[PDB]
Amino acid sequence: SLKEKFAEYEAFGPRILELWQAARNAFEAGDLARVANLLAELKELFKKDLNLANAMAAEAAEAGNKEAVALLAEQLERLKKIQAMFAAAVNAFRAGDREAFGALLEAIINEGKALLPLVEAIKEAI
């Protein structure tokens, strides 16, 4: 159900943000084995998050909820942008490009913080 999906999507956002900030902490403390573990978890979580977002968008479309289709489209743009920085952040971690990885962590986390207040919008729209 659409509201049940949204209940699940709503919890993903703050967990994902937590993991990113933990990844920065682990990186700044030089704990690369932990950074890699966080990245793996984030890879699974982010996959599920984006799958849920896509499923909710198609469901809202079925129901003719034009208001929810638009809010969900904005969330998918932000998530696509995050996915691209994520790919680049992974590449930088593997090359050991510390400045690129740090600069990409800041910008991913600033995108993560900006998703959260938009998410409340989708709640009332469904």
| Method of determination used here | X-ray
Q: Which residues contact 30 (CB under 8 A, 6 or more apart)?
A: none
Contact 63, 47 (CB under 8 A): no
Domains of the chain as residue ranges with CATH: 2-125 (1.20.120.230)
DSSP secondary structure letters along 97-125: -HHHHHHHHHHHHHHHHHHHHHHHHHHHH
Alpha-carbon separation of residue 99 from 17, 93, 94, 106, 123 (angstroms): 20, 10, 13, 11, 37
66-95 vs 32-62: helix crossing angle, rounded to 10? 160
Q: What is the resolution of this structure in A?
A: 2.1
Contact 44, 80 (CB under 8 A): no
Q: What whole-number distance in Å separates Cα of residue 97 and Cα of residue 120?
A: 36
Largest CA distance in the chain: 50
Amino acid at 109: I
Q: What is the CA radius of gyration of the chain?
A: 15
